[PDB]
Each structure stands twice: as structure tokens, then as C-alpha cells.
């Protein structure tokens, strides 16, 4: 029989690393049906905040307005998604945006020629003033209660160095961007992960002994820290499977064609998660788990 208790006995997690952007960990004794659910929720269903509505007031630059709005929608914003609610689309445009669900960013930048530039200068930063527009130039314009709620943490891009646009003297950009909550299954700009995926733990079943110089070349067919030579007997053994990238270079030699079988542990998933910047990868994974549970609970409580 299968039971939640029998799953709780055998399931375990091995966090290999954890940063503010990337978290590498393991899920053991779980089914692909649930690991894939977690991965799909991380990529598509976990909400984040991105620029959606752009209100241009002037754009005399070479980049056209739709392209510039698309770029401004792509830049990730360091906003905690819980700090704002969801936009009610059915409401009219006047009352649709409010201080609890919309974040206003502005970008006003004019390019003027630098009258102190040296002769023979080819650097645009020395020839012109504001010849480059960066995501850091996206000022945050708090309105209403967010002037107090966001005082602890001002909204800035996760990558202020993103080169939004370039300018030349006389040219200018003046725009407002409205940032709301959305999910990545709608538009890829709301996806909060650079990439979240997994891979089964590789298995390297050595069938016959590889004693001798053959161990030197057999170990040469894998990533450096995967096969080792035993201190006692000159034998090859599997040190670390996680270090193996499955490239089957050993299979390309008929010497080992009947000495090793390459397989996988069909329940040992190595989740690698990277964050765009708005949330930590561990919190992304936690939110995906919670989303699956909450959607199941909504189905349970829905009348049939």
C-alpha cells in the first residue's frame, strides 16, 4: 500500500547549496509526477511584478515606443510580490490601478552634447550627456499608502546595469510604466526564475573490474570528480554521481562496451533553481509547493 506516512518515511531533501539567487538541492523518493508539478509551478504559476502598462509622453530616440516598452517590461523589479495585490481587470481604467496593486516607475532623460569633451574623443559617455539609458534610471514614484509601506524597501531593478536605450543630443525619453502582479504562464516577463529544472541522479554501474591502466582511461571518460582509483587495489569506483554530466563518452570505446551500464535513479531529482532577483530561490520553491497545495484545496472545496 501507499500512504502519506509511507511517503513521509522515505522522502528526504539534501540542500547542496543556497545563495540569494541560486539554490541547488535534491528531492529523493518522490515521483516525477510531483517533481514536474513543482518545476512547472516555479516557471509559470509563481507570481512576480513586471512592467505592464507604459504611458509614453515623448520618445525621440532611435528605439521605437513598442520596443522600449517591451524592454521595460522585461527588466525584473525587486518587489516582494506579497506587498501588492492583484489587479481586477473588469474594473474601468480609471479605478483599475490603486496604491495597493500598482507600482509607478518613471523615466525622464534628455541627451545634451557635452561642451567639455576632448577633441578626438570617441567615447559616447564623454561626447554626450546621458548617451545611455539604464534600468537604474527608472525612478520609483510612490503614491498613496505605499509612500509609507515601501519606505522600508524602495523599488529598484534587480539589475540596474541593464542598458535600456541609447540617446543622442536633442533626443529624449519621457514615460511612465505601471507595474502589477502577473504570472509567467501569461507572459514570460512575470517568470521569477532564470531557469528552474531538475535532472535524475546518474547511475554508473561498473560491471567488471577495470584494474590497471584501463582505470586511468575509464576515469578519463567522465567529469574529473566522478571516478577515482582505489588506494588499496588499483580499481575504478564511482565517487560522486552528481558530478557526472551524462555524455556517454565511455560508450564510444569498445573497450568498456561491456564493462559499464549508464542509467539513472528514477526518484532522485537534483533541482537547480536560479532567481531573476525579486525573490530568493528557496522562497520560490516554497511558494510553488504552497501553490500546488492551495490549488488542490480549492478543488476539494469547490462544489461538484
Amino acid at each position: 500500500e501507499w500512504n502519506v506516512e509511507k511517503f513521509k518515511k522515505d522522502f528526504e531533501v539534501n540542500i547542496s547549496s543556497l545563495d540569494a539567487r541560486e539554490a541547488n538541492f535534491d528531492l529523493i523518493n518522490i515521483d516525477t509526477s510531483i517533481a514536474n508539478a513543482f518545476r512547472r509551478i516555479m516557471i509559470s504559476e509563481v507570481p512576480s511584478v513586471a512592467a505592464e502598462y507604459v504611458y509614453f509622453f515623448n520618445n525621440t530616440s532611435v528605439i521605437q515606443d513598442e520596443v522600449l516598452a517591451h524592454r521595460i517590461g522585461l527588466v525584473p523589479l525587486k518587489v516582494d510580490p506579497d506587498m501588492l495585490t492583484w489587479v481586477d481587470s473588469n474594473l474601468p481604467d480609471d479605478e483599475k490601478f490603486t496604491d495597493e496593486n500598482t507600482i509607478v516607475l518613471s523615466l525622464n532623460v534628455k541627451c545634451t552634447r557635452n561642451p567639455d569633451a576632448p577633441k578626438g574623443s570617441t567615447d559616447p559617455k564623454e561626447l554626450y550627456n546621458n548617451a545611455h539609458v539604464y534600468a537604474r534610471d527608472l525612478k520609483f514614484e510612490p503614491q498613496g499608502r505605499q509612500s509609507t509601506t515601501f519606505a522600508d524597501c524602495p523599488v529598484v531593478p534587480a539589475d540596474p546595469d541593464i542598458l535600456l536605450a541609447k540617446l543622442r543630443p536633442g533626443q529624449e525619453i519621457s514615460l511612465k510604466a505601471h507595474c502589477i502582479l502577473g504570472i509567467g504562464g501569461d507572459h514570460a516577463k512575470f517568470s521569477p526564475v532564470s531557469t528552474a529544472s531538475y535532472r535524475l541522479l546518474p547511475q554508473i554501474n561498473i560491471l567488471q573490474p577495470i584494474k590497471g591502466e584501463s582505470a586511468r582511461r575509464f576515469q578519463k571518460c567522465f567529469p574529473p570528480g566522478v571516478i577515482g582509483i582505489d588506494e588499496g587495489s588499483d580499481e575504478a569506483y564511482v565517487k560522486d554521481a552528481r558530478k557526472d554530466t551524462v555524455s556517454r563518452e565511455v560508450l564510444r570505446y569498445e573497450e568498456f562496451a561491456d564493462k559499464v551500464k549508464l542509467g539513472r535513479v528514477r526518484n532522485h531529482f537534483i533541482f537547480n533553481v536560479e532567481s531573476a532577483g525579486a525573490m530568493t530561490p528557496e522562497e520560490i520553491f516554497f511558494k510553488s509547493v504552497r501553490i500546488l497545495k492551495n490549488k488542490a484545496e480549492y478543488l476539494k472545496n469547490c462544489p461538484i
Binding site: 524592454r71 525584473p76 542598458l163 543630443p169
Partner: protein, 69 residues
């Protein structure tokens, strides 16, 4: 024309690395693979986005209808 904000395949923000890539190519005498690795681009999907960018925006910008030439 101008560097893309994100990598097309995975979505990693690579729009803040074009100027650094040029700096590491010019000031440091780094080859393209070394510069891409030192920018943090490991997946070839992310490497291609910077390794193959053309940067036509600079050539577009020389035709300025708002300044005397």
C-alpha cells in the same frame, strides 16, 4: 539592434553584460570564451546572446534628425 534584456531560451538577464563584455575584450586581453565565463554565462544559450550580438544601434544613432551634422 540593442542588446536584449534577457536570454531567449532560459530567460537569464544578459542585458547588463554587453558593456562589461566589451570592456573585458578591450582592456583585458581576454578571448570570448573566457570573457563569457567570467561574466557568469555558462549555458551556451546565454553565451550565444552576447557572443553573437551585433549592436546596430550605434550605426543607427549616427543619423540624428535633431542635431546639425
Amino acid at each position: 539592434m540593442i542588446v536584449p534584456v534577457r536570454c531567449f531560451s532560459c530567460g537569464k538577464v544578459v542585458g547588463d553584460k554587453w558593456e562589461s563584455y566589451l570592456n573585458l575584450l578591450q582592456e583585458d586581453e581576454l578571448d570570448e570564451g573566457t570573457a563569457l565565463s567570467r561574466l557568469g554565462l555558462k549555458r551556451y544559450c546565454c553565451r550565444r546572446m552576447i557572443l553573437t550580438h551585433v549592436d546596430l544601434i550605434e550605426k543607427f544613432l549616427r543619423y540624428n534628425p535633431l542635431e546639425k551634422r
